[PDB]
């Protein structure tokens, strides 16, 4: 709680597989690494961005208001107003995913977390 930040780039090299089906509620390294791209679209401030631009980028990217605010409140599951890229990270993928066709509940698979937390009791 209370903000966080780590544009932690790190990839070897991004490969076109275009078999991105196996992946559908997991994080893959190949999504490790595209959190830093997007995130370079997303015209980041000063290394970081904001909900303000989260919003922006995610519209523009052809999807509703009711879509792209579910999203946003998808996004940082604490609500930081920030979402720092670790919270992009699982954010980019929801945009292409719902434009396939989809939709989900404000709680994100354990698996999509890869690292569950141990907020239920």
Do not use: C
Not at 77 to 101: C, H, P, T, W, Y
């Amino acid at each position: 709680m209370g903000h966080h930040h780590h544009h932690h780039s790190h990839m070897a090299q991004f490969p076109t597989p275009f078999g991105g089906s196996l992946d559908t509620w997991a994080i893959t390294v190949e999504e490790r690494a595209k959190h830093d791209q997007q995130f370079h679209s997303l015209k980041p401030i000063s290394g970081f961005i904001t909900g303000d631009q989260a919003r922006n980028f995610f519209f523009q990217s052809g999807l509703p208001q009711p879509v792209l605010a579910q999203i946003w409140a998808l996004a940082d599951m604490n609500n930081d107003g920030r979402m720092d890229q670790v919270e992009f990270s699982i954010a980019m993928k929801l945009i292409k995913l719902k434009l396939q066709g989809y939709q989900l509940p404000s709680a994100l698979p354990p698996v999509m977390k890869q690292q569950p937390v141990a907020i239920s009791s």
